[PDB]
């Protein structure tokens, strides 16, 4: 969804350094703020608030 | 003219000036080699040395 806006390909060119694998190592990364903002749907992570 | 008598002046010959606010120039993607369809194509005469 982020590769099809063209008008949002910015933000792409960002995100090629911490594509994770899975979802649950960016949790843990947050977790000790080796990242800063993951994108991902809303009652999964209202789940882990 | 791809005849004799096809007369036609819709071909218009447009220089710009490099200035971020509004005419941001960047590098060909590599990646495709084609510029992201929100862009627009650009030529630049570029010398070698002195
Ligand atoms: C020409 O080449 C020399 C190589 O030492 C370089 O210092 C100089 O900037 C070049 N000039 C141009 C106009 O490319
Ligand atoms: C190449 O020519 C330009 C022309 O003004 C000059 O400014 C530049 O210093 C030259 N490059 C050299 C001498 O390396």
């Not at chain 1, 590769?3 to 843990?28: D, F, G, P």
């Not at chain 1, 000790?32 to 993951?38: E, G, I, M, P, V």
């Not at chain 2, 929100?38 to 630049?44: A, E, I, L, Q």
Request: charge should be negative.
């Amino acid at each position: 969804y982020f590769r099809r806006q063209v008008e949002l390909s910015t933000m792409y060119r960002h995100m090629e350094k911490h594509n994770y694998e899975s979802a649950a190592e960016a949790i843990q990364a947050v977790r000790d703020n080796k990242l800063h903002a993951f994108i991902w749907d809303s009652a999964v992570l209202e789940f882990e608030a | 003219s791809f005849s004799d008598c096809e007369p036609d002046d819709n071909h218009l010959s447009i220089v710009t000036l490099e200035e971020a606010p509004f005419v941001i120039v960047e590098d060909i993607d590599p990646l495709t080699e084609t510029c992201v369809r929100n862009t627009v194509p650009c030529r630049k005469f570029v010398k070698i040395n002195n």
